[PDB]
Amino acid sequence: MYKEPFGVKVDFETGIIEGAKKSVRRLSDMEGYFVDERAWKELVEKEDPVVYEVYAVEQEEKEGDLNFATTVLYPGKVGKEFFFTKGHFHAKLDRAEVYVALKGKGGMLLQTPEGDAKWISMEPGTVVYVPPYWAHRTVNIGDEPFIFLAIYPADAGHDYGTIAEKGFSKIVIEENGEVKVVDNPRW
């Protein structure tokens, strides 16, 4: 039997989606993700901020179908490192994604299985094409929430493990007032 087409309202100012399933990630949920573990433990013990929220409208994992989700990535730093999403590869590696930036100042860090990295800056209106095989993480390099919408194949799934252990070959930090993308010393 056919599934019912539907329309949902997405508020471009808040990233909120009608009828979506919410996921909240606090700093506590990201142990082993940031370089400055001391700054991380400090911030978690102190206030444990929400780093991001995701509003997902997902389908059964089936070829050819599509999921979509907004993420509201909060502004902040862990030491010199800007707040970011955990990042993942797809489970079905060759699945692509399209992102549409809606609000705030940010960027995406991408890397291949071999760890070659790319950085793509994002401001409202930027659409980013995440090709097959690239892991991706977004980073909020500004003072307000960075909000985007992602559309991904329903069967892409998420591989978080490889990134959780090694991280990305690069990191995004504030150095002398400027945003810089530099080698990750942990890598």
- Cβ-based nearer residue to a copy of itself, 7 or 177: 7
Q: Do the strands 146-153 and 117-122 form a parallel or antiparallel pair, or are they unpaired? A: unpaired
The window from 9-17, 77-85, 94-102, 165-173 that contacts Ni ion (CB under 5 A) reads 94-102
Q: Does 60 bind a copy of itself (CB under 8 A)?
A: no
**Token duo for residue 174:** 């504030």
> What's the closest the beta carbon of residue 97 comes to ligand 6PG, in angstroms?
6
- Cβ-based nearer residue to a copy of itself, 30 or 130: 130
**CA max distance for the chain:** 59
Q: At residue 123, what is the residue type?
A: E
Residues sharing a CB contact under 8 Å with residue 53, sequence separation 6 or more, in sequence order: 15, 22, 23, 24, 25, 71, 72
Return residues touching a copy of itself (CB under 8 A). 2-12, 17, 57, 59, 62-66, 68, 92, 94-98, 100, 108, 110, 112, 116, 118, 120-122, 124-134, 136, 149, 151, 153-156
